[PDB]
C-alpha cells in the first residue's frame, strides 16, 4: 500500500493546464448517446435520465505507454446503484439495458464499483474482488467525491489513490494494450468530471 517512487514523483509535479486537460477529457465522439459532454464545462458529462439503462463514455486518449494519473469527481448523491470507474479498450461497449456494472462486465474493461468496493473484469465469467484489499468482508469503505486513477502502461497496472493514500494495485496484466479512461453510470443527471493531472514517459 506504499506509493511507487515513479508515482510519488508524478504526484509531486504541478498539474497540467486546462488546455492540456482538454486533450485528455471525455470524448463526445466516443460515448453512449444517453450522455453528453457539457458545452460550457467540457471536463464534465451529463447523463440523461433514461430508465433501465447503463451508460459509459471514454476519454479522448488511449494510453499505450508511460504512467498516467487523472482525477475523477463524482458526487456521492449522484452515484445510484452502480457507479463504476476504470479503463477500457476501444472495443468495450458503452451501453447496456438494465442497471449493471457495465465497466468490468466483459473482457474489454476493468472497473471499480465505488458503492460495492469491488473490482470487475470479465464479470460475467469471473468473480469480483474486494478493493481496497484490506477491507474485512462486511466492512464499509466510503469513496469520497473526488479521487485519483493511476494507469501504469509500462508495468501494466491500474491503481487508485484516495485522499492521498495509495489503495494498492487493482488490476494487473494490462501491458501491450491501448487503454482509455471510462466510467459507467446509471443515475439520472449525474455529472462526472475527469481531470488529467500528468503523465511520465518510461525509463
Amino acid at each position: 500500500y506504499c506509493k511507487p517512487t515513479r508515482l510519488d514523483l508524478l504526484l509531486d509535479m504541478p498539474p497540467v493546464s486546462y488546455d492540456v486537460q482538454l486533450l485528455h477529457s471525455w470524448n463526445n465522439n466516443d460515448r453512449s448517446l444517453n450522455v453528453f459532454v457539457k458545452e460550457d464545462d467540457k471536463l464534465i458529462f451529463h447523463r440523461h435520465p433514461v430508465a433501465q439503462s447503463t451508460d459509459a463514455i471514454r476519454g479522448k486518449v488511449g494510453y499505450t505507454r508511460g504512467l498516467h494519473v487523472w482525477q475523477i469527481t463524482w458526487a456521492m448523491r449522484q452515484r445510484g446503484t452502480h457507479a463504476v470507474v476504470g479503463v477500457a479498450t476501444a472495443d468495450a461497449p458503452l451501453h447496456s439495458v438494465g442497471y449493471t456494472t457495465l465497466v468490468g462486465n466483459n473482457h474489454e474493461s476493468w472497473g471499480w464499483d465505488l458503492g460495492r468496493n469491488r473490482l470487475y473484469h470479465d464479470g460475467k465469467n469471473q468473480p469480483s474482488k474486494t478493493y481496497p484489499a484490506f477491507l474485512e468482508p462486511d466492512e464499509t469503505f466510503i469513496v469520497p467525491d473526488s479521487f485519483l486513477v493511476a494507469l501504469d502502461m509500462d508495468d501494466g497496472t491500474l491503481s487508485f489513490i484516495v485522499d492521498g493514500q495509495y489503495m494498492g494495485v487493482a488490476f494487473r496484466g494490462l501491458k501491450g494494450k491501448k487503454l482509455y479512461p471510462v466510467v459507467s453510470a446509471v443515475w439520472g443527471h449525474c455529472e462526472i468530471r475527469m481531470r488529467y493531472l500528468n503523465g511520465l514517459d518510461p525509463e
Binding site: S32, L33, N34, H48, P49, V50, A51, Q52, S53, D55, G80, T81, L94, H95, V97, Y99, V186, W187, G188, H189, C190
Partner: peptide
C-alpha cells in the same frame, strides 16, 4: 425511479442500436 430515471425520456442509445 431508484436511479433518478423515468420512462418518459427516449432511450436514444437503445434506438441507435436497432
Amino acid at each position: 425511479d431508484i436511479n433518478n430515471n423515468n420512462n418518459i425520456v427516449e432511450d436514444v442509445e437503445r434506438k441507435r442500436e436497432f
